[PDB]
Amino acid sequence: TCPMDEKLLSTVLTTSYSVIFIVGLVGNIIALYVFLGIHRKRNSIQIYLLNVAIADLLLIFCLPFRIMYHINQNKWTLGVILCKVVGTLFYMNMYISIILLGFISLDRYIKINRSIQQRKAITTKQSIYVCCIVWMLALGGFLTMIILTLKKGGHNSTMCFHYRDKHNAKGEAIFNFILVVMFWLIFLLIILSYIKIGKNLLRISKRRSKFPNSGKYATTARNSFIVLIIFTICFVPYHAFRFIYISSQLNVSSCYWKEIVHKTNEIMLVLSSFNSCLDPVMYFLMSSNIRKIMCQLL
Amino acid sequence: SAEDKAAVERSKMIDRNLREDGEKAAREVKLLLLGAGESGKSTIVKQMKTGIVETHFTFKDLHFKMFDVGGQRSERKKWIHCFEGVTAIIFCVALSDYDLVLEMNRMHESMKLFDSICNNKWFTDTSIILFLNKKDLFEEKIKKSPLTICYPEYAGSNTYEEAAAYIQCQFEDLNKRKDTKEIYTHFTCATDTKNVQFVFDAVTDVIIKNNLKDCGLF
Amino acid sequence: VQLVESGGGLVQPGGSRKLSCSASGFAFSSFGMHWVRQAPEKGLEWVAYISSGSGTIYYADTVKGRFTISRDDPKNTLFLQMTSLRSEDTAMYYCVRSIYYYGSSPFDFWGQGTTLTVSSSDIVMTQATSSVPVTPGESVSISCRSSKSLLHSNGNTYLYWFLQRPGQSPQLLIYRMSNLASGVPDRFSGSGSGTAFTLTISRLEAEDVGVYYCMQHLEYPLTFGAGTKLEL
Amino acid sequence: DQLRQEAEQLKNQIRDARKACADATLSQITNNIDPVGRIQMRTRRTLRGHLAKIYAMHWGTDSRLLVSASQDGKLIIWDSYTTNKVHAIPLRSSWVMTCAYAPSGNYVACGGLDNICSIYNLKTREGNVRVSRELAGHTGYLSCCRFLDDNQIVTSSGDTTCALWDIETGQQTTTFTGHTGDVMSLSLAPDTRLFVSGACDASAKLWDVREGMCRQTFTGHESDINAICFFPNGNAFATGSDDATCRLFDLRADQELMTYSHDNIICGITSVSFSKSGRLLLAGYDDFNCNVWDALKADRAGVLAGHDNRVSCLGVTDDGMAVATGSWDSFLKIWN
Amino acid sequence: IAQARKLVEQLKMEANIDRIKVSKAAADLMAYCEAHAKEDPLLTPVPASENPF
Ligand SMILES: CCCCCCCC/C=C\CCCCCCCC(=O)OC[C@@H](COCC)OP(=O)(O)OC[C@H](N)C(=O)O
């Protein structure tokens, strides 16, 4: 081991996550309330956004367990079981949210750009099927890794979340590279969708065949870009460096190189988990009905 | 239980038939035609081509049902809710009856009826396509009849453009739910076949607005 | 209503034929269709069933895997395809309609059928006799018994009574116990319990003679009775 | 003027005579009997398949079959015991606001704003449901078709008049006139000799099916009456209007017996139906729900909690087993 | 001279009616509800053995 100073980073990592905790908890609880409480009827987008609130809600729940390690002594007092649970439950919410956000971007493409009249609101049927498929398959990956590590793996210790190389179990390291590349494919879908949505509503406002309320098209044109950009800043940095991070797990290296590689990764997750608390705010601000209610009550 | 199983299978087949019929009915536009009777709605229904009348027409690969219910001769309060959910309300107002009377002139009656329909409880998210009739007759009539006859607070020349703009603004001002829906005013033409085009543009705008509202982006 | 069959004739054994049933006079697409057969002076024996829209398909135990049941709803025509034919397939084939909902008569109309000749678990119902002489104006009682209790938990017992006059196709008389068919005289009545079933006729006339059959639905396959012939 | 004075004075003496002969209120006698307490009802079955607002329903005579009319131009016959779609009838006009089921179960007549009451024959040799006859002659929107037998049906219409028809011939046999407002509902007596109808003129009138004279009239509502039905014995009836009041009248007392209103209720009543025993009056209200009143204590003993939209129609079976409810949310719920 | 003759004739016909008092009429409904109380499945819950829903 090469344990240099990590006291100052521990404070900022603990504080940043707790800021996400307080924002995310109030963010999802209000968001969860406004998808089942006031919205008796649910559309596919209202279904997909519902699960993102649920999926991310667990991630804020994972925050108090994570911060306990950093702030007390940078040592894990609990058992290896809870360390491997929270450390793997946290990543499930990250990648369930990403795959669900790609599903929101997909329908918004087929509901706006190519849709002629409507889709009869029969997409909510397979919306639940898709969300259930994604949830169950995600749990399949969650339980699979956690048992091939807790039992098959032989290296355990008294610290959690630390930089531990993957030479002992190459399956996780190969799985991460498999898991990273599918994110970029999803990210390509999201950037392809919202760019085309913005471009299509750009030309609609350009024609201006009809004078009344043509200014909403320009607003919705920008909003298609606003939500794309926030997804791009909070997720592209992390998955761009994961290629080098994975490569560092499958080769010999000096400890100084390992530290800065470990040093960045904890900061990158601050950005990656920053989306999960900001996404409820997105729907609060973007939606006309929700924006009015929040503004008029405040 | 074999008979019960066959009954359940027949029920499932019936249900798929209703689902397909609902799919068919969900991709068609519903317009409710309204007016004061003498507002030249007959010219409108002719240009698109007892009890309640349906007019069916396909334009630009879009199927339109228009419901003319002006001949009901009953209180609107008891049957208006049956149209809660139409794509649009096509309102028609004649511009010739600013001075003509049916007591009071017909234009004020049309304004009252438009205010009643627009501010109706059941029509909150339903948009209005407004038509103004008798363009040439109204232009010719004001040459000898000042607009002060109808409106005493008006201040403008007896020209077609100023009077038309004033009438359009007066109809607009009666709307008080300006943030949810809007009034889409148009002046009727004869040989351009543009009333159908304006209706198509307005209903397309309404459809896209509903899609954007559903998607949450708007 | 008119069901007309075609495709019968004389066929060498091991050959192939196709039986067609042309429907004209009712909503064919909403009626399930049965193929039933009657051997020369032996009795009725169910062959096949195809539901509305070909959603459900059922075959008899003695033939499953040798025949093909087909439907052409656009043309209101019913098909039955035959691959292998023994000497036991020699029979008159009847094309029957059947509609299933709460209160329907699911064997209302029987086709005239066509003859097919070839060169040379299950619930069982039995009728006691095979020849009963009687004079018109005398009440006549017929009965048959089954192995299982056809009285379902629903409350209704699935028993069917058909009449076949000499030289004619069967006519549906009773479809549970006491619900008379449409176009049947009131004089017929039926009752029973569980396994024992009786049909009574008051003031019989000369046109009421023929062979009576009792059948159960309750389950597939469908089995008939032996068939009791009245004489005059 | 002379006719106005005569009408006003006649109203004066009949009002005075009816008021002076009032002995005591219904509560004044029935307060002694014990109440019913809390009635728990739960949705045993829920019916799906309509894709628009459900405007009317009617129970079958066997207490197992149903009929439902909805804004999408569909007429469905439900097997309420097993929630199976027995029949689906595509209506010619999609603007239906009432319809009913024949007491013999052979026919269903269903119409609406198109001023036509179409008759449908369910038991056809063809296998499907064909239109029997279209009854024309009403100049206003229709309401409360009600079969008397297989060949005569009484209907109300928005042209201030009700009519008795003859389905064999198709001509309006008898005309019932006198309403000074759109008649919204009518209920047949159990004996099929009399019936009552409530109109938008805030009045209810009792009519004779054979002579067609105005036998009796009832006042007390402030707004248009939208719902009405008979007491099970044929000697009383309850009306419901938009002023959030249900009232029970007696045909022989000729005056209101009891009011069924509370301060919490602000919206009117949409449907009214009675229990078999004549003690439990169910009333489907405009807001979202139905209230189950004690028809003798005027106390709401239970509420049907479903129907996320306005409830439009009620129905209580002949055997009194259950209560089917239909609402603008396109869902039928059976409560038992 | 005959615009409202039918209305006043109906009102006069509405007068000569056999008025039966409320105390004689409320008791009728009370008796009807007492006599048929036992047979209503809604006034008193029915056992699920014979309940078809
Ligand atoms: C169509 C196919 C879809 C497949 C994906 C479905 C959704 C996701 C489901 C399954 C992935 C499970 C593995 C994901 C693991 C990613 C991160 C990772 O490798 O974490 C490893 C754990 C330790 O695991 C036991 C050795 O790291 P932590 O200890 O939590 O953190 C270490 C460090 N702080 C860091 O994260 O770098």
Author numbering:
A (entry chain A): 45 to 342
B (entry chain B): 6 to 54, 182 to 234, 239 to 354
C (entry chain S): 2 to 121, 124 to 235
D (entry chain C): 5 to 340
E (entry chain D): 9 to 61
Article passage:
S3E-LysoPS is an analogue of sn-3-type 18:1 LysoPS, with an ethoxy group at the sn-1 position. Receptor was then incubated with the Gi heterotrimer (Gαi1, Gβ1, and Gγ2) and scFv16, which stabilizes GPCR-Gi complex formation, and the complex was purified by anti-Flag affinity and size exclusion chromatography. In summary, the S3E-LysoPS-bound cryo-EM structure revealed that the acyl chain is accommodated in the TM4-TM5 gap, a characteristic shared among some types of lipid-sensing GPCRs such as LPA6. Within this intracellular cavity, R1523.50 and Y3277.53 in the conserved DRY and N/DPxxY motifs are directed toward the centre of the transmembrane bundle, facilitating interactions with the C-terminal residues in the α5-helix of Gi (Supplementary Discussion). The most characteristic feature of the GPR34-G-protein interface is the interaction at ICL2, which is located at the root of the α5-helix, and thus has a significant effect on its orientation. Due to these differences, the α5-helix in the GPR34-Gi complex is 10° perpendicular to the receptor, compared to its position in the LPA1-Gi complex.
Here, we report two cryo-electron microscopy (cryo-EM) structures of human GPR34-Gi complex bound to an sn-3 LysoPS derivative and the potent M1 agonist. GPR34 adopts the canonical GPCR topology of a heptahelical transmembrane bundle (7TM), with an extracellular N-terminus, three extracellular loops (ECLs), three intracellular loops (ICLs), and a short amphipathic helix 8 (H8) oriented parallel to the membrane. The ligand-binding pocket of GPR34 extends from the centre of ECL2 to the middle of TM4–5, forming an ~25-Å cleft that is laterally open toward the membrane.
